[PDB]
Amino acid sequence: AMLIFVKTLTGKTITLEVEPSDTIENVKAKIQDKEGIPPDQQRLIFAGKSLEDGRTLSDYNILKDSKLHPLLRLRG
């Protein structure tokens, strides 16, 4: 269980408990569970890298050790 931050378009920065093998769909679903945002109205990025459906967090080398907590962002 690794903690990530997700910055919504409202300025609000929320948190999420993810697995490194969690698909981007899973993360978007969690975001839907915490903010009521429909997954199809979600565009995730990390450090300018688009996070696309059909892939996983490990695919993007986002997560590292437990000390670091990546800030994900929802685009427009």
Next chain:
Amino acid sequence: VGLRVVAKWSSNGYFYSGKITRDVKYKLLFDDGYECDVLGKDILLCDPIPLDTEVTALSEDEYFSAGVVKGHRKESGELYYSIEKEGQRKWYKRMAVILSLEQGNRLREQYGLG
């Protein structure tokens, strides 16, 4: 009211910097650009996070991690923190520096509201 504040809006949630706008619970306008009503018990009243406070800072590579306040710098209405991580210091936006539940809990005795 009108005082700088680091406050959280959720149990086991993180503390974020902002300001008290109105006394209702208190209405908080965060530096992140969000405003909402939060409990008074979840509000830390210290405008500059004191030296050597363990905080959570957002580095240039977009990772939040724990660090330690070593200096403040006010540049025309905007504050920047000098945060040390593993022996290296960097300058962070005020909005980039936050507190975990524990990190925030340590400050409650001294800067807690009420």
